[PDB]
Structure formats: structure tokens, C-alpha cells
């Protein structure tokens, strides 16, 4: 039968997770 899958460029969002982490941190101090 049918199924679905994917995976792509996981580090990019993981790199963005770093770039999220700053704005996870910044307004957490900018407040």
C-alpha cells in the first residue's frame, strides 16, 4: 500500500535553531 515519507536539510533548521535561540534569548532579556 501507499505510504509517505521525507527528510531534508535537517541541519539548516538546526542552524536556524541557533538563530531561533538568540531571539529565544533576546526578548527574554529585552523584556
From Swiss-Prot:
Cell location: Cytoplasm; Endoplasmic reticulum-Golgi intermediate compartment; Cytoplasmic vesicle membrane; Golgi apparatus, cis-Golgi network
Biased composition (Basic and acidic residues): 1-13
Domain remarks: The N-terminal region associates with membranes, the coiled-coil region binds to microtubules and the WH2 domains promotes actin nucleation.
Full protein name: WASP homolog-associated protein with actin, membranes and microtubules
Known role: Acts as a nucleation-promoting factor (NPF) that stimulates Arp2/3-mediated actin polymerization both at the Golgi apparatus and along tubular membranes. Its activity in membrane tubulation requires F-actin and interaction with microtubules. Proposed to use coordinated actin-nucleating and microtubule-binding activities of distinct WHAMM molecules to drive membrane tubule elongation; when MT-bound can recruit and remodel membrane vesicles but is prevented to activate the Arp2/3 complex. Involved as a regulator of Golgi positioning and morphology.
Tissue and organ expression note: Expressed in brain, lung, heart, colon and kidney (at protein level).
Subunit structure: Interacts with ACTR3; indicative for an association with the ARP2/3 complex. Associates with microtubules; in vitro binds to tubulin heterodimer in a 1:1 stoichiometry; decorates microtubules with a repeat of 80 A along protofilaments. Interacts with RHOD (in GTP-bound form).
Regions annotated as coiled coil: 1-27
Domain of life: Eukaryota
Amino acid at each position: 500500500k501507499r505510504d509517505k515519507i521525507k527528510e531534508e536539510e535537517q541541519k539548516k533548521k538546526e542552524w536556524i535553531n541557533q538563530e531561533r535561540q538568540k531571539t529565544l534569548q533576546r526578548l527574554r532579556s529585552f523584556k
